[PDB]
Structures are given as C-alpha cells and as structure tokens.
Design a protein around this nucleic acid. Structure first.
Ligand SMILES: [Mg+2]
Ligand SMILES: [Mg+2]
Length: 754
DNA sequence: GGGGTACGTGATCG
DNA sequence: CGATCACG
C-alpha cells in the first residue's frame, strides 16, 4: 500500500475486474480485485414480494441479465430505520439494463443507489481514499501548435509543433528546420507524433498537464494519428488516450496516469473575462506572456520565415503550463483525498458534485440510504421554487467583506438538515425566523453532524500548524485546512442545488433567515462607524466611507473585522476579502470593480465570447475603461453614441461585424435554423464538407425577415454589393453589451443614441 | 476496456 | 411564450 492515483474496471470473460493504480516507493503498481459485486437497493411493499422481484430479467449484448443474489438489509432513510433489499448483479453494465424493469414492478416502492459508477462504488465501499501518503509524483506538461486557416474542419491542418516541459526544461519537436537549442527537428508530422509517444513512455510521468487538452491537444493528436495510421500508446497498459463525452464537450483520460487539464481547474478557481494562457499566467505569477496568433503561425510555417518566434511561443506554452500545473495540482490532490475520489474526476467537478461525493461516502460509513437524483419534472420544479438593491453610481475606495464562513456554523447550531425538518412527535425544535421551519433537536442531523466533524478537523490542523517547526508539513497542512474550508463553505449552496440528492429548499431558506440576523448586525455596526453599504448578497458586502482617504477606509475595515469576530460566538467568521479603487453595482452578482494595481474584476457583465461581434466587445471594453480607469460615465455614453452613429453611416469595417458560431451536429439534425446554420446549409450546397466542430463566420445584412435569412458567410461578403444591418448591430449587438452597465448610472437604451 | 451523459445565462427560432 | 442552441 502506497498511494492510489486512480481506479477503473476491465471485463474478463464477461466478468468485471477492478483495477487500482498505485504509486509505491516511486514504483507504478496495478492491483486487481475480481470479488467486488455490483448492486442496487429496492424498497418493497412487503417481504413476500422478493420471490417475484428476484425473478426479474433483462437483456444486454444479446444475452439475458439476472439478479445474482438478494440480501435483506437494515439501513437509515430520512433519519428513520428502513428495510431494503440489496440486489446483486454480475456486471455493472447489468444495472442500466435491469433497474427500470425492477422500478416498473408493482411490489417495488422505489429503487436506490442505481447511478453510482462501479469504480466509485468500489472506492466508497472498500473505504479507499486516493492521494494519501507522502508519495512524490512526476509531471510533464504537453502542448501542440497546428496549422489553421479560417473555418477549416477540425483536424484538416497538420500539427506543426509539439512542446513539452518538466523540471529538466522545455523542448519543441517540429518537422521544419529551426536553429534553436531547445528545438528537435524531425522529418515529418508522423515522426514528430511518434517522438512525443517516445518522450511520454521514456519519462513515464505520473501526471500529464495540458491547458485545454481535453478539447484541443488530445482530440487533435488522435485525429492526426488516425489520418497518419499510427497508434498513441500513452497509457501505462499501452492503451490510446480515451475521449469521454462530458456534457457537450470532451474529457480525455490516459490510463495509469493523471491527465490534469488546467482549463476546468483555473476556470473554477479564479475570476477572469478570458481564460487565455497569457491572461491566466499573468494573473497567478504577475508576469507577462507574449501571444502568437494562429494567422501569424500559418504565415511563418507556409513562408518558412519567422519560425524562431513561433518555436519560442510553443516552448513558453509548455514551460508556463508546467509552472501552472505545479501551482494548482496540490489543492486538487487534497480535495481528491478529502472527498475520496480520483484527481481526474475531482479536477473536472463542481463543488456541488464534490459535496455529493463526500456525502455518498459518509452515507455508506453511517449506513444511510442515499436519496435519488431528481427526475426531469422534479429538477424543473426545484428550478421554479422562488424562496438589498445596490447603490447607483461610481464609488471610490471600496472594501469587500465575505460572509460565507458564517453558514456552516448556522447549519450545525440549528441542526438544519432535511432529516430534522418538521418531524412528527418531536420534543424540542428550532424555529427559523420569518419562514417558520421547525428543525428537530432530538438527534443530530446527517449534514450538521458531518460539518461539525469537518470544522473540528480544520481546527486541529490549524493548531498543528502553529505548533509545527517543519516548513514542509506546514505547506501540506495549509492545503488540507484550505480544502476543508472549500468543502464546508459549499454546503449552504448545495441545499438549494436542484440536482442535489440531499436537496432541501426549507433548509436553504432557514439558513438564509438565521444568517440575515448576523448580516443585519454587520450592516448596523458598519453604518454606525460611518461606512455606507453599497452592495449586499448572501456571500458578502461592499462598503466605503464616503469621501475618506483609502488608507483610512482600509485601517477602519481591518479594525472592524477584528472587532466583529470578537463579538460573534464560536467559529462564525467575517473575512476581509479586499480593496478596490473604484466600482459600480448593477444588481445581484452584476458589478464591476478595479483594484489599486489597475486590474478590472467583473461579475455577470462582460461579453468576451466569439458569438458577439468585435464592435460590441470593443465598445463594451471602452465603456468599462472609461468608467473604471477614467472615472468618466459621460465619456462612456459619448463612446456608445459615436459607435452607433458610425454603424448608421456605414463607417465601421465589416471585419468588426463577424459573428462566430460552431456547428455541433449534422445539418439535418437541427430543429431551429439559426443564422450560422442557414449559412452552413448554403456552404454544404456549394460542395463544402460541413462537419461538427466547424466554426461559421457570418455578417447580418440589411433586409426583410428574421436574421437567419439575412446572414451571409464572411468569405461571400463583398463590401461593394452587400450592405450590413446597422439596426441589428446597434440594437442587438452594441446596445445590449452596454445597456446593463449604463443602467447603474441612470441611462435607458434610448439615452445611448443621438 | 466503461459510463455520472456539466451548468447557468441570453439570444433567436418557431 | 416555450424550445432550442451555443458560449466558456
Ligand atoms: Mg475514471
Ligand atoms: Mg498552445
């Protein structure tokens, strides 16, 4: 026993075998388990029914499926004893084949734990936790550069560079002559791909770091390897990287290794308008990175001139991907360990799903039958359940306070749990203020009980940190207490998460109602100190001392948190999040701020996406800069009025009017024909190979009808013959981009034109 | 060699 | 309107 890095299962003679991938004293070891059996639970109307239920049959892969063994078990459901039947199956793929046949049965009240993947079922049931121990993993960052031309089919252009980096340095493999110390010149695209395969197998990294390798680098490598008739044996069992369908996007796994894609991780952890590698690197390390755009890479490759610049960019991409991976992996590894699921899965999950995985493991440990995920009907009804207005204008010297560390303590002290809510024949209860929900005090609730243990464990870690003289364990314990804080602070939100198993609307409302008493205290104490509260949400607040010096606002705020935390009982804690030079607030989670270092931080306002024209994105950036960098809302209004007049008078270049939208299906599969699909159908008719992945660039022209009938492919646009729709670019592009921002200053859509 | 098929928001279609 | 579709 060393350190579990992953778990999966393989089929042998039609039977499942669990594979546990381990790292033991620097050596890769694979353990096999043939004895663990898949199962579900069935709640029956009467014990007699089991004789009919155990005889239920299904079909899978032409062969019939049966219930292997049945076992009567006593468990806890909704904080009540319950008798259910454990229905054993031969193979985990038998469960989706037979579960609906069992649920359909007249004697079956309900079925449970029927959507838990087999490898996760194993980890939970066997009490196995990944990423435990001091085991030191090896890492390798990998990146690729491709030859791309406007609106090409995914994979048409060859891979022209492959870069990798580790502690030994950053290297580039290319198949054109470049005279640089870190460049390896091979003969072909085929030999460059074979070289990457060789590097990976020889370095044998435990972790492969990419920046959006799930959707770009690995699908592209696989497509080009296919075209070239070569295999990619990157798995430690010599298997090829496996593309998995996660939502509408992809996820790539490399067996026996951890494919650590930084893109989903950084997107969750930090707030940015764009997640370009350059923006991300500057945000984390405060250092600038140069970008070489796709068109520049194409020009250099095709001409053979300026290739040294392209190779430096490729090398830096790998080098910074390595630095970022080493920065963000320790926290992902501690979250994995805390929820008891592999890094690959954990790094690609929301906190709501991390809470559910923690709860599922703790439910097994406590013999608690887990509730089911809602059906489409129940999921929609939860979204429909309904259950303070910001200060207008531009504010200077804004202080940010965080409330989130208040709620776990409220859940624990008031025993807020779906299993304690409105229980019959309960002797003592807590009543939520205003909402009136009653929570039984007769037993500790499942969630309050888990939260208490989490918070106690964090206090123990913090105590070990103060009393430790070792900087190495202090670093590790710091990630551990941080991982707990992240998990504990996600419970409040989870009660209201419509896809949650332990979803509880009355729990969320009650926590909000009890929480409000502390928010009202903070608000009152701030206001008596001369502070003006500009924005308040359940998460925190923004305040300033109108007309005060910035150092004075800071000093008073820091002194205020120190004071309030000394008045608030237990682990109830207020946090000073930060300070901002300027800011404005539109509504709930719609605001924009600027720090003292000139970095603009926004929430729910920016439109930095390819399906918005450059004119709209450029105008919005200019409006935000006029307001936050120049403190000038009159400048911002003049910007909009000038841009809209320029659109009216056909003074805007057509290149700034292009909309880009991806084709995601065969064209016949579309139900609603949007502008990009109408344009795509016309291209296909012209002989163009239209395939999913293709990005359609179009311009909306002047005329009668919906925009779809008036959209033209950019390659077909002729400035002499065609006239763009100025009304569409004004009303549907530019004004929507700025109208929300300017509403915070008293302007309506009508006020932003001449 | 498997395996749960994000999520939240806004636009344009029908 | 609800339904469909795409962004990151
Ligand atoms: Mg897996
Ligand atoms: Mg790159």
């Amino acid at each position: 026993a060393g350190m579990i890095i992953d778990a999966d299962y393989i089929t042998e003679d039609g039977k499942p075998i669990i594979r546990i991938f381990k790292k033991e004293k620097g050596e890769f070891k694979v353990e096999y388990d043939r004895t663990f059996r898949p199962y579900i639970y069935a709640l029956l109307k009467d014990d007699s029914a089991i004789d009919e239920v155990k005889k239920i049959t299904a079909e899978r892969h032409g062969k019939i499926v049966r219930i292997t063994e049945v076992e009567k078990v006593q468990k806890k459901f909704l904080g009540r004893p319950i008798e259910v039947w454990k229905l054993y199956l031969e193979h985990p793929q038998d469960v989706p084949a037979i579960r609906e046949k069992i649920r359909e049965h007249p004697a079956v009240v309900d079925i449970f734990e029927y959507d838990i993947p087999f490898a996760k079922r194993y980890l939970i049931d066997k009490g196995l936790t990944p990423m435990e121990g001091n085991e030191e993993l090896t890492f390798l960052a990998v990146d690729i550069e491709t030859l791309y031309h406007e609106g090409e089919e995914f994979g048409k252009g060859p891979i022209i560079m492959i870069s990798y980096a580790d502690e030994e340095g950053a290297k580039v493999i290319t198949w054109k002559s470049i005279d640089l110390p870190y460049v390896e010149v091979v003969s072909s695209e085929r030999e460059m791909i074979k070289r990457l395969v060789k590097v990976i197998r020889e370095k044998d990294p435990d972790v492969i770091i990419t920046y959006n390798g799930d959707n770009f680098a690995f699908p592209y490598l696989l497509k080009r390897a296919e075209k070239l008739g070569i295999k990619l044996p990157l798995g430690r069992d010599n298997s090829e990287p496996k593309m998995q369908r996660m939502g509408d996007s992809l996820a790539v796994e490399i067996k026996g290794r951890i494919h650590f894609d930084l893109f989903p991780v950084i997107r969750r952890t930090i707030n940015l308008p764009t997640y370009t590698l350059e923006a991300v690197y500057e945000a984390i390390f405060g250092k600038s990175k140069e970008k070489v755009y796709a068109h520049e890479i194409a020009e250099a490759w095709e001409t053979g001139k300026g290739l040294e610049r392209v190779a430096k960019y490729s090398m830096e991409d790998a080098k910074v991907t390595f630095e970022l991976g080493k920065e963000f992996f320790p926290m992902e590894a501690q979250l994995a360990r805390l929820v008891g699921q592999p890094v690959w899965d954990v790094s690609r999950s929301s906190t709501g799903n991390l809470v559910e995985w923690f709860l599922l493991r703790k439910a097994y440990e406590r013999n608690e039958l887990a509730p089911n995920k809602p059906d489409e009907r129940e999921y929609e009804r939860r979204l429909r359940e309904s259950y303070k207005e910001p200060e207008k204008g531009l504010w200077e010297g804004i202080v940010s306070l965080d409330f989130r560390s208040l709620y776990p303590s409220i859940i624990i002290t008031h025993n807020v749990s779906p299993d304690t809510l409105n229980r019959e024949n309960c002797k003592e209860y807590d009543v939520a203020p205003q909402v009136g929900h009653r929570f039984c005090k007769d037993f500790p609730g499942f969630i309050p009980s888990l939260l208490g243990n989490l918070l106690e464990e964090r206090q123990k870690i913090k105590k070990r940190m103060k009393e430790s003289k070792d900087p190495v364990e202090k670093k590790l314990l710091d990630y551990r207490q941080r991982a707990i804080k992240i998990l504990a602070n996600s419970y409040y939100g989870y009660y209201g998460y419509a896809k949650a198993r332990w979803y509880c609307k009355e729990c969320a409302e009650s926590v909000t109602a009890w929480g409000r008493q502390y928010i009202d205290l903070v608000r009152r104490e701030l206001e008596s100190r001369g502070f003006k509260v500009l924005y308040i949400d359940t998460d925190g607040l923004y305040a300033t001392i109108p007309g005060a010096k910035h150092e004075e606002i800071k000093e008073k705020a820091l002194k205020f948190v120190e004071y309030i935390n000394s008045k608030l009982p237990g682990l109830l804690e207020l946090e000073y999040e930060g300070f901002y030079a300027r800011g404005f607030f539109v509504t709930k989670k719609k605001y924009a701020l600027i720090d003292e270092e000139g970095k603009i931080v926004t929430r729910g306002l920016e439109i930095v996406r390819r399906d918005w024209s450059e004119i709209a994105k450029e105008t919005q950036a200019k409006v935000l800069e006029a307001i936050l960098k120049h403190g000038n809302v009159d400048e911002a209004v003049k910007i909009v009025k000038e841009v809209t007049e320029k659109l009216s008078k056909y003074e805007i270049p057509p290149e700034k009017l292009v909309i880009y939208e991806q084709i995601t299906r065969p064209l016949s599969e579309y139900k609603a024909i949007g502008p990009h699909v109408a344009v795509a159908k016309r291209l296909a008719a012209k002989g163009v190979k239209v395939k999913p992945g293709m990005v359609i660039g179009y311009i909306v022209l002047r005329g009668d009808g919906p925009i779809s009938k008036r959209a033209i492919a950019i390659e077909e646009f002729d400035p002499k013959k065609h006239k763009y729709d100025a009304e569409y670019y004004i009303e549907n592009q530019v004004l929507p981009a700025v109208e929300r921002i300017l509403r915070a200053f008293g302007y309506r859509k009508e006020d932003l034109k001449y």
